[PDB]
């Protein structure tokens, strides 16, 4: 869990990010699929795409970006309610294990990608205090998602 | 395995990286450790470094960077001799499996990082025919390292 200052520093960041949630989610997923093509495999929509400029344009990927961003949104907006953050990531985890059958490690890879993009987008307003704050939310998603994978028996 | 055209493409690309192997290896390791803090954990000598400027400047992180580029150069310089590269990568696999006790997925994460660092530094000499070529070398490396981990029973 986080403080009130770390929570506020993360939400202020996410405030800007989510202003153009579509164009940010897309930069994230395109980099995820370019730098880790093994991640595409899980996606019947994208598994046959190699051109990154083709991914930027594709409507289904934009539909997928929104979907991730929006779920992340519910987490960031509820960091004050640890019963809410728990319950949301429980659901994301379980569904990714049971329906999507995704190897839990990719959540770690995706996280790092989210850091790289955020670090480029917001270089001039990403001080040490905010980096650590963001590292704390990363660890939070990861250990809640992995407990769901454990709970379901992976 | 790569064709004669794909081999030369990788080599012409690698000749540019390796012209300043220290600087490039350092750039790679630093991003690796920042976006994947859990990779740091493995290194007794770096697990407590947090400031990226502090890393660039440390002689020991420089030395480790020259060790990676050093080994990679031997793979790349020998891409005509597949028994040769098969041997080097298996040696690298078994060492990291048995002596360093590094989990094998970290090799995929590092390559991903190598691709993003190369894209940033050498955009001008990284056209789609080379992107495509480099991606095959990556798949070679990984499956020869996966095989090394399996041969040893991980
Ligand atoms: C921050 C972490 C993540 C969040 C919040 C997230 C969110 C979502 C949401 C909300 C959906 C749609 C609802 C559903 O069917 O479950 C979805 C679908 C999906 N997710 Fe994720 N996701 C995350 C990470 C990942 C990762 C790392 C992968 C593996 C590459 C992945 C693979 C998939 C797949 C294959 C689908 C189905 C897409 C389809 O309908 O074809 N997710 N995700
Ligand atoms: C194919 C890419 C890689 C190459 C060419 C490479 C090369 C090397 C070399 C030459 C050494 C020193 C000699 C030795 O003991 O083998 C070394 C040490 C080491 N490597 Fe790697 N490595 C690679 C990937 C990785 C990855 C992905 C990790 C994950 C964290 C890793 C972790 C380590 C550790 C913990 C050591 C020992 C550190 C020490 O000297 O105290 N390596 N590597
Ligand atoms: C991922 N969606
Ligand atoms: C790895 N050094």
Numbering used by the authors:
A (entry chain A), B (entry chain B): 18 to 171
Task: Give verbatim lines from the article.
Almost independently, the sequence of this globin was identified in mouse, man and zebrafish and, given that it is expressed in all types of human tissues, was eventually termed cytoglobin (Cygb). Human Cygb consists of 190 amino acids, showing extensions of about 20 amino acids at both C- and N-termini with respect to standard globins. In the absence of exogenous ligands, the sixth heme iron coordination position is occupied by the distal HisE7 residue in both the ferric and ferrous forms.
Since the HE7Q mutation disrupts the endogenous bis-histidyl hexacoordination with HisE7, the comparison of wt Cygb* and its HE7Q mutant provides clues on the transition from exogenous hexacoordination to the endogenous one through the pentacoordinated species. The two subunits (A, B) found in the X-ray structure are assembled in a dimer identical to that found for native Cygb*. This arrangement indicates that the structure better fits a pentacoordinated protein. The largest deviations are found at residues 60–66 and 70–83 (CD-D stretch and beginning of helix E), as the shift from endogenous bis-histidyl hexacoordination to pentacoordination drives the E-helix 1.5 Å away from the distal site pocket (measured on the Cα atom of the E7 residue), increasing the distal site volume by about 73 Å3. In the HE7Q mutant the Gln side-chain matches the position of His in the pentacoordinated structure, as the side chain amide N atom is shifted only ∼1 Å relative to the His Nε atom.
